Amino acid sequence: HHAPPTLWSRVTKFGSGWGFWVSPTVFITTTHVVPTGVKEFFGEPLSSIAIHQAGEFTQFRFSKKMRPDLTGMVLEEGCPEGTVCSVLIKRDSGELLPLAVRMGAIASMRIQGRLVHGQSGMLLTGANAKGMDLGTIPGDCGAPYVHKRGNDWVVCGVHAAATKSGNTVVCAVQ
Ligand SMILES: *[C@@H](O)[C@H](C[C@@H]1CCNC1=O)NC(=O)[C@H](CC1CCCCC1)NS(=O)(=O)CCCCCCCC
Predict the structure, then answer these.
(1) Rounded to the nearest 10 degrees, how much is the dihedral formed by the CA atoms of 41, 34, 98, 160?
(2) HEC readout, 13-80
(3) Ligand 1 pocket: which residues have CB below 6 Å?
(4) What topology does CATH give the domain 1-72?
(5) Catalytic residue positions?
(6) Are 165 and 87 in contact (CB under 8 A)?
(7) Residues of the chain with CATH 2.40.10.10
(8) Nearest-angstrom CA–CA distance, 167 and 100
(9) Could you give the CA distance from residue 69 to residue 143 in angstroms, rounded to a whole number?
(10) What is the rounded distance in angstroms from the CA atom of residue 96 to the CA atom of residue 26?
């Protein structure tokens, strides 16, 4: 494999997209994917969830141990610029599509009206990454950006946007 099955099992369907289990109690995702006007998430009422949203990055910390099968991993404050990361794309249809990305700079961006604390990067999957097979598409938001700090995997962002060209992607960062 590229990424272990345990890392993929952290990628969970959520709203119009996906999120990522950092630990048994920390779930991260992309803000525009998150349900609104709900009294609960994953069965838990809001009073049992520390909810924090800042410019397309959303963190939940549950009081209940939600995924105790998991150990905690590091959430970095952004990806290391210039390094190659992996976007762990799951699809509706069951495919696992880990897309390699070389990460650009962390910058602030207004995007379709919303203020994004984001980080661009360039896919390494083809000359263009237009379309379904080599790039990110609607429904993919929330997928984690990961890389290995030595012998351990870390996560540094959640997927938020891509150009129509397809080569440039943006993740939301802390
Ligand atoms: C996930 O919801 C979706 C994923 C995109 C769609 C097309 N290919 C993808 O990977 N994201 C969007 O549709 C995104 C949503 C906005 C909502 C407000 C906050 C920012 C994201 N819109 S978009 O189509 O990706 C807009 C183009 C992005 C340009 C990026 C410029 C980089 C410098």
Answers:
(1) -160
(2) EECCEEEEECCCCEEEEEHHHCCCCCCEECCEEHHHEEEEEECCEEEEEECCCCCCCCCCCCECCCCC
(3) 17, 32, 56, 111-112, 114, 116, 120, 136-138, 140-141, 160-163, 168, 170
(4) Thrombin, subunit H (2.40.10)
(5) 32, 56, 141
(6) no
(7) 1-72, 73-174
(8) 11
(9) 20
(10) 23
Going by C-alpha positions, the residue among 3, 1, 20, 13 that lies closest to residue 94 is 13
Domain boundaries 73-174, corresponding CATH code: 2.40.10.10
C-beta separation of 17 from 46 below 8 A: no
Listed resolution, Å: 2.5
Q: What tokens appear for 16 in the block? A: 């119009």
DSSP for residue 152? E
